[PDB]
């Protein structure tokens, strides 16, 4: 209700000796509590909108302008007949990776090929260093220059 300790007390009006102290009390309560504290809680709420929107925008731009598993940043695939739109679909599609994980799981622990044994060795026992962390075999050129 607005002023705070004002408009509910007795309103001394200039006759009592306690008038100046009452005015100071009223104005000081109104300033610190009603301005600063309520403005602090609402500044906290607005700041949380700012942080949440910043997180969402960062997540969306890093989801759209970079590759998945591959990790590249979509400016490396500017030329040389392998663009990003088919690098996502045909080269580093994660659905093919899930297909490979379930192919390792379903198959009968024998009579499979070479790389599947290596992958199943890295899956069952230990870590995940068989993923293409930052390399894609499309940025690399021919080795004729050193040869």
């Amino acid at each position: 209700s607005g002023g705070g300790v004002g408009d509910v007390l007795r309103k001394p009006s200039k006759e009592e000796p306690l008038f100046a102290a009452r005015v100071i009390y009223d104005l000081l309560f109104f300033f610190m509590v009603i301005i600063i504290v309520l403005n602090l809680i609402f500044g906290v709420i607005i700041d949380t909108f700012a942080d949440l929107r910043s997180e969402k925008q960062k997540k969306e731009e890093i989801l759209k302008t970079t590759c998945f598993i591959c990790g590249l940043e979509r400016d490396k695939f500017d030329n040389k007949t392998v663009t990003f739109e088919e690098h996502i679909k045909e080269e580093h599609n994660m659905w093919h990776y899930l297909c490979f994980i379930v192919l390792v799981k379903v198959k009968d622990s024998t009579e499979y090929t070479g790389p599947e044994s290596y992958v199943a060795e890295m899956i069952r026992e230990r870590n995940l260093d068989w993923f293409p962390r930052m390399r894609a075999m499309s940025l690399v050129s021919s080795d004729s220059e050193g040869e």
Binding site: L9, V37, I41, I45, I101, V102, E116, M137
Partner: protein
């Protein structure tokens, strides 16, 4: 540290994967610490393999599979019915037999005619949208046939049957059924849905407000509203700490006012006669 490229046949079990969980795993995974999404992807890969096993096992259900396909339809019917029946219980609670026609039914009759005209205009222009408008018009017409209490009882019975057939759809559409009973008891959304069912049943039985409670619990679900509530609640510890700061500050001001301005604390009041 050399890189290969292998081509393999896709397993026949991978085609039993839904589009919803597909989009969920595409949009939900996050970079753990070293700018990489691999670690959470492997754990949800194991969970996805278990989910595809459950989906392949449940494909031979089909009546249960037919029930579990159209769960968004059950959710939409439950939500629209809850909103409509909250609107009916809001406008009319003196009840004691409201069907007396003390100039209310004439205005209600004109409102029903206008609503029927608007529903006809909506069905004419927007033919593909507004399937629930016909059901709302039929429910409004049933209010003119029988009393408000039988209509409310019918709507409550339809709501509880829709919820009890939606729970079976939700149980079927998840793999927690065969892991045991404590596994689905430990689930959070399952507990929320059973709380919703208990609230709906107790509203049908005991004193019949309770639909405001389920309305709050169900409208609170949607994504943008949940986003703004996540904005008010994600940093809740500073908010409660500065609320405690306000509390101690007004405690100090109360101490000072009690100390000196003790006789200036009179307040206006009107008493009720005995």
């Amino acid at each position: 540290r050399t890189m290969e490229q292998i081509v393999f046949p896709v397993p026949s079990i991978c085609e039993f994967l839904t589009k919803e969980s597909k989009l969920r795993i595409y949009y939900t995974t996050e970079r753990d610490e070293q700018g990489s999404k691999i670690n959470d992807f492997f754990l949800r890969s194991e969970d996805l393999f278990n989910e595809m096993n459950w989906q392949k096992k449940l494909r031979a259900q089909p009546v249960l599979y037919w029930c579990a396909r159209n769960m968004s339809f059950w959710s939409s019917i439950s939500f629209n019915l809850a909103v409509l029946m909250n609107l009916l219980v809001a406008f009319f609670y003196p009840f004691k037999g409201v069907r007396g026609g003390t100039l209310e039914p004439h205005w209600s009759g004109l409102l029903w005619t206008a609503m029927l005209i608007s529903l006809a205009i909506v069905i004419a222009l927007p033919k593909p949208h507004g399937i629930r408008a016909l059901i709302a018009s039929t429910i409004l017409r049933l209010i003119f046939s029988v009393g408000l209490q039988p209509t409310l009882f019918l709507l409550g019975a339809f709501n509880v049957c829709n919820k009890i057939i939606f729970l079976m759809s939700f149980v079927g559409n998840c793999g927690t059924f065969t892991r045991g009973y404590r596994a689905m008891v430990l689930d959070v959304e399952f507990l929320y849905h059973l709380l919703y069912l208990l609230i709906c049943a107790m509203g049908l039985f005991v004193h019949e407000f309770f639909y405001s409670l389920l309305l709050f619990d169900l409208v609170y679900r949607e994504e943008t509203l949940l986003n703004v509530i996540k904005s008010v609640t994600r940093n809740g510890r500073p908010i409660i700490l500065t609320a405690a700061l306000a509390l101690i500050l007004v405690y100090l001001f109360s101490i000072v006012g009690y100390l000196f301005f003790k006789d200036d604390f009179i307040l206006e009041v009107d008493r009720l006669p005995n």
